[PDB]
Design a protein around this ligand. Structure first.
Ligand SMILES: CC(=O)N[C@@H]1[C@@H](O)[C@H](O[C@@H]2O[C@H](CO)[C@H](O)[C@H](O)[C@H]2O)[C@@H](CO)O[C@@H]1O
Ligand SMILES: CC(=O)N[C@@H]1[C@@H](O)[C@H](O[C@@H]2O[C@H](CO)[C@H](O)[C@H](O)[C@H]2O)[C@@H](CO)O[C@@H]1O
Ligand SMILES: CC(=O)N[C@@H]1[C@@H](O)[C@H](O[C@@H]2O[C@H](CO)[C@H](O)[C@H](O)[C@H]2O)[C@@H](CO)O[C@@H]1O
Length: 151
């Protein structure tokens, strides 16, 4: 249940509900993977969705149009969230977009099924831990919800 399907063949930004910031992937400067206020659009904020197959049918890899890297989310090692080359070579590259309901209609969690984690974008901690993850079979918080933007 609750599968969300992003559009294919068009780049999008991923904006956090709690943070009003969009994820990004860049090779420089550090941090390479972080988030940015949504009012400022930059190349590093654009991603496409890569459909999965087999065990990963209904899941997607999230590929940066700026670096070519896909996002990952794992419980260990550190860093727990980041990016890596390829088109989803590793299990922790495969996300179920888990559709929200109620006040979360229109939004989804980004659930890395293989690592049992969800992505987090928040402003309630220092910048070193604002873009992170949380166990997926635990409490749900607004900072785990994202939506897709085309501007
Ligand atoms: C740790 C931290 O808060 N760093 C930010 C930088 O990321 C940010 O740099 C901009 O980031 C956007 C991301 O889409 C573009 O890459 C842009 O070109 C960068 O300048 C700067 C400036 O906003 O602020 C902090 O340093
Ligand atoms: C900061 C950074 O990105 N370091 C990378 C590690 O992430 C990477 O570890 C692998 O990452 C993939 C991500 O999909 C899987 O989690 C895999 O199991 C990890 O071993 C290592 C090795 O490629 O390289 C850097 O340290
Ligand atoms: C680095 C690290 O693992 N820090 C964790 C925090 O992220 C975690 O904070 C919770 O995170 C969720 C994420 O959806 C919400 O932001 C929630 O409000 C936070 O309490 C805390 C508590 O579990 O543990 C570490 O500090």
């Amino acid at each position: 249940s609750n599968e969300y399907n992003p559009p294919l063949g068009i780049a999008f930004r991923l904006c956090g509900l709690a943070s009003d910031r969009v994820l990004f992937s860049r090779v420089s400067p550090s941090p390479e993977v972080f988030h940015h206020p949504k009012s400022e659009v930059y190349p590093d904020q654009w991603f496409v969705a890569i459909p999965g197959s087999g065990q990963n049918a209904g899941c997607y890899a999230i590929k940066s149009k700026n670096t070519g890297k896909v996002l990952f989310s794992r419980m260990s090692p550190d860093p727990r969230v980041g990016h890596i080359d390829g088109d989803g070579k590793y299990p922790d590259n495969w996300f179920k977009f888990e559709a929200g309901s109620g006040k979360y209609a229109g939004y989804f969690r980004l659930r890395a099924v293989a690592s049992d984690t969800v992505l987090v974008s928040r402003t309630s901690t220092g910048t070193d831990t604002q873009v992170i993850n949380y166990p997926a079979t635990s409490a749900k918080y607004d900072d785990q919800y994202f939506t897709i933007l085309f501007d």
